[PDB]
Amino acid sequence: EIFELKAELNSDKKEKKKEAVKKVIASMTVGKDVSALFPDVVNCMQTDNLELKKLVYLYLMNYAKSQPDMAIMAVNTFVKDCEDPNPLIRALAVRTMGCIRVDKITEYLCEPLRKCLKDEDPYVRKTAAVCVAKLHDINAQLVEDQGFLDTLKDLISDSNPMVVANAVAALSEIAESHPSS
Amino acid sequence: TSYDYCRVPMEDG
Amino acid sequence: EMRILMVGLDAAGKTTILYKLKLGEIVTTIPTIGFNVETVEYKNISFTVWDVGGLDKIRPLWRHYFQNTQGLIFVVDSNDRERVNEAREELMRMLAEDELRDAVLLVFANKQDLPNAMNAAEITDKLGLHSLRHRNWYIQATCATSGDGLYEGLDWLSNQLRNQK
Amino acid sequence: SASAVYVLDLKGKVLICRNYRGDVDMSEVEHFMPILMEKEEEGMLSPILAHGGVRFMWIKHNNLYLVATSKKNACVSLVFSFLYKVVQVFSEYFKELEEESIRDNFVIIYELLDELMDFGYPQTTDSKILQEYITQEAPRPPATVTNAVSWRSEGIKYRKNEVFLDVIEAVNLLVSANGNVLRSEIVGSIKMRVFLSGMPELRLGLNDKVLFDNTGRGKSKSVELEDVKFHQCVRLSRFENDRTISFIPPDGEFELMSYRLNTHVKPLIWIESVIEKHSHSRIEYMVKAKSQFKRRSTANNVEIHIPVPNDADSPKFKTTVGSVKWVPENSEIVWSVKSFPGGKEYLMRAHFGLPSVEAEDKEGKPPISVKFEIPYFTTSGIQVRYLKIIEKSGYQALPWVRYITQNGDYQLRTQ
Ligand SMILES: Nc1nc2c(ncn2[C@@H]2O[C@H](COP(=O)(O)OP(=O)(O)OP(=O)(O)O)[C@@H](O)[C@H]2O)c(=O)[nH]1
Ligand SMILES: [Mg+2]
């Protein structure tokens, strides 16, 4: 029942893995326990097709809580996607990064988020400013140890006020979690 | 809608 | 249109030679916690290459790819004598499965720029590649920064994938 | 500060789901519908339900519940305005939003629920700008998505340059059983349809009372706009300075401003109704509808609803002008007049029966509520004066307007 799905998923044709992952997140929509098919969609993730990678990021976001040890095979792909010339796929990878709620993963993700805060193109900056708050939701002292807050306050003094608005939102999110020290 | 418009002036100098 | 792996202990220059076969550059690469997959179209065969890193927490996650696996390339660590023993142990733990049984073997002596790195005969005797039944194995000395020995290994791989002219 | 935007159906199962923070478990929506059916039978229904530490902000669409769960002290009005904007975005991608649209377009709806909100914060919800890289048919995000002018994509070129305006009135009214007016306010809404090329800086001009008192024309007819709610696009600091309406319009239909003022003028359509409800026998409706406005105007397709009892039978309708259909679904008569000229006074007599065995429960008294529509006429008397198209390129556009008077909740209570 799922074995044909995995066999069609471990193919090499575009139209096979694309219909495979659409069938997967169609079964995820109706509420079927598709958590056991985790490490086979991760193999067919690195594609240049962008309508497909949103579905795989969706699967990585809805099923990293249930499979915490299996989700270690994604960090290289996110830190690869956070250097691509397309800014949409960078901000897509960045807002996919923080929602993965695994404590063992956030220790490696601090460097590309640090780079994307210092990016030029403001779309990925207004994504990464909220992703800082996503990361502070998981481990608060890790973000203070990495020193993102002093970099986060520098986007408040930036122009192009959407990055300013998301940075003020994230800072008000983090300062609510602090004891007001 | 079967209703028709009325043009307005531009500058109102 | 064949899949192929690149496994081995970490910091062995394997994603370096992967992106050297991909583009032809020597890129700055982090220690690969996850994995890389690209393809290299070469001699009318798309070499779909599956590099997996060699960190301690990601070695047991190699069995999740071993369902429907066709080929294998193992890359040694010639310059770390204290870790090549546990690299051989991870290899024989990988070679102790009846699931990956049809794959060919291809060993790359990598990072051949230091004088301390061994030749293409001593690594075989340290690993014991002769006593591996049903393993059509072959060794190759590869220098990562120059790119030598890579196309020869790909050509022997093409002679192993198809068994015809 | 939402946590998980859920979209349910009328049975309570999940049509589509999208969590952001993980502070609310994905099985917490299973406690929504039993809690709603529990609160339904004690009159303590609320848009904010409560399950321990998980609150359920929800709205009701056609067949859909857009539950947005939260755990902490969420900014509630943020969540509800987000949910109605999500409704508007889905109804701008989809011609209707029903159960048949979620399970057939899940390719794009997960993308939208990933794009509109991250970590519980709305960040990009203008649907027309969002049509440019999230399509059902991908390039870089346009510069309009990041720039300060975030509702108008530069590079749109049309053949003509048409500026359409619809200054649509909506008379609210509430007349008590005594025959006196309790509340009478007009909620008007200028609704534009812009077909312009370039980056225009329009300057709409009204006959505002404050602008004329600060101008010096304080003896002509000027509307006292008691409150104005402009769109995002209007420069609000410049409006607070000198009542000036300056903006860069979006591309397509939108609602520019929503003015709201009171009315010391008589109601437009008056419903003088009498009810001879004899017990157990019958009921007579010697209702009349006079039009208090000017003789020239022509109220199109009005529908004067009058609520009847629940169990009426054998109708008889002695009218003068305009037919009567009897709708027992809503349990009311719909005295539909096709064209209702001003100054006239039309009489209508409805006559039902009533069952001789009495009812078991009470009935309730809904109000007489008309559905009128008057073109080319404003009750408020607002007059747009000018519309200065300002473009760096330089052309002449054709600004068109039309005035429609509608109803809002034009209710008249019964005895
Ligand atoms: N001097 C020298 N150093 C090399 C050479 N090849 C690889 N290295 C070093 O070895 C490291 C490993 O190379 P990579 O391929 O980028 O990393 P990897 O082998 O995939 O190891 P993981 O990413 O942890 O899986 C590099 O960072 C280099 O510093 C080489 O030919 N000469
Ligand atoms: Mg690597």
Side-chain angles (χ1 to χ4, degrees), chain A residues 94-108:
Chain A
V94 165
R95 70 167 64 91
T96 310
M97 278 166 64
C99 294
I100 297 168
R101 201 267 299 169
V102 178
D103 294 332
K104 303 295 288 183
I105 300 300
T106 63
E107 294 177 354
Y108 298 103

Side-chain angles (χ1 to χ4, degrees), chain D residues 98-317:
Chain D
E98 288 179 352
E99 297 177 356
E100 64 183 1
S101 296
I102 298 298
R103 292 183 291 111
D104 289 333
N105 286 321
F106 60 92
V107 181
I108 196 169
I109 297 167
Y110 285 109
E111 299 176 353
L112 291 175
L113 292 175
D114 184 72
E115 181 67 28
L116 294 170
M117 177 169 276
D118 291 331
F119 194 67
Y121 293 159
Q123 66 185 2
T124 300
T125 59
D126 288 329
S127 68
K128 187 67 182 295
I129 307 300
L130 191 61
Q131 288 182 355
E132 293 178 352
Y133 64 97
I134 304 298
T135 60
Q136 58 182 353
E137 183 177 1
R140 293 177 65 250
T144 308
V145 184
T146 64
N147 199 357
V149 182
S150 65
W151 58 90
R152 175 63 179 269
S153 297
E154 54 91 18
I156 298 170
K157 183 69 174 66
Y158 292 105
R159 182 63 59 86
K160 292 181 73 68
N161 289 313
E162 292 176 350
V163 181
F164 288 162
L165 275 73
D166 294 328
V167 183
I168 292 173
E169 308 292 325
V171 177
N172 285 319
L173 188 70
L174 188 64
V175 177
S176 68
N178 292 319
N180 52 5
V181 174
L182 290 174
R183 182 181 64 190
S184 176
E185 65 185 3
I186 296 173
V187 182
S189 297
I190 294 174
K191 183 173 74 68
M192 295 175 73
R193 291 180 67 249
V194 175
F195 291 106
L196 285 172
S197 297
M199 297 299 290
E201 185 180 1
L202 277 70
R203 285 191 296 274
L204 190 65
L206 294 178
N207 54 359
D208 193 359
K209 183 176 174 66
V210 180
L211 185 62
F212 284 170
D213 288 331
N214 294 116
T215 299
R217 289 174 287 177
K219 64 178 71 176
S220 65
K221 184 177 179 181
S222 67
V223 58
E224 184 182 2
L225 298 180
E226 186 174 359
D227 194 3
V228 177
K229 287 186 177 292
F230 291 108
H231 200 196
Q232 176 185 359
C233 64
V234 179
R235 301 280 75 77
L236 298 172
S237 66
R238 292 180 66 189
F239 180 74
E240 187 65 28
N241 287 321
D242 55 354
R243 310 289 290 169
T244 302
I245 305 171
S246 178
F247 62 96
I248 298 97
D251 186 74
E253 183 179 1
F254 65 98
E255 184 178 2
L256 182 65
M257 58 178 281
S258 296
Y259 60 96
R260 193 264 301 169
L261 77 152
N262 297 317
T263 301
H264 293 92
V265 194
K266 295 185 290 295
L268 296 176
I269 291 174
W270 183 263
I271 307 300
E272 193 272 330
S273 66
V274 292
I275 295 170
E276 290 185 355
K277 184 178 177 180
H278 298 283
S279 294
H280 303 286
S281 177
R282 58 181 177 175
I283 188 164
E284 286 90 0
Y285 289 155
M286 276 74 75
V287 62
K288 64 179 70 175
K290 61 185 74 65
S291 64
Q292 300 292 107
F293 61 95
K294 295 290 182 68
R295 272 77 172 176
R296 294 181 184 270
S297 297
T298 300
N300 289 319
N301 62 13
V302 314
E303 287 182 353
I304 299 172
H305 295 84
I306 297 169
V308 304
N310 195 4
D311 53 355
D313 49 0
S314 178
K316 294 180 177 66
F317 300 118

Side-chain angles (χ1 to χ4, degrees), chain A residues 42 70-79 105 108, chain C residues 6 14-15 30-37 50-55 57-59 61-62:
Chain A
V42 182
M70 305 300 172
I72 308 171
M73 287 296 173
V75 178
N76 194 7
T77 61
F78 288 111
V79 305
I105 300 300
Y108 298 103
Chain C
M6 289 184 70
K14 54 187 184 297
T15 45
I30 51 95
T32 58
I33 305 300
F35 77 104
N36 287 112
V37 50
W50 293 91
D51 188 83
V52 180
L55 271 297
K57 63 177 72 175
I58 62 173
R59 290 175 185 174
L61 296 175
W62 297 1

Side-chain angles (χ1 to χ4, degrees), chain B residues 1 3-6 10 12, chain D residues 300 373 376 385 401-402:
Chain B
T1 60
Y3 292 157
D4 289 330
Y5 291 104
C6 296
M10 180 179 175
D12 196 3
Chain D
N300 289 319
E373 180 181 1
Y376 299 100
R385 296 180 65 85
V401 78
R402 73 182 194 272

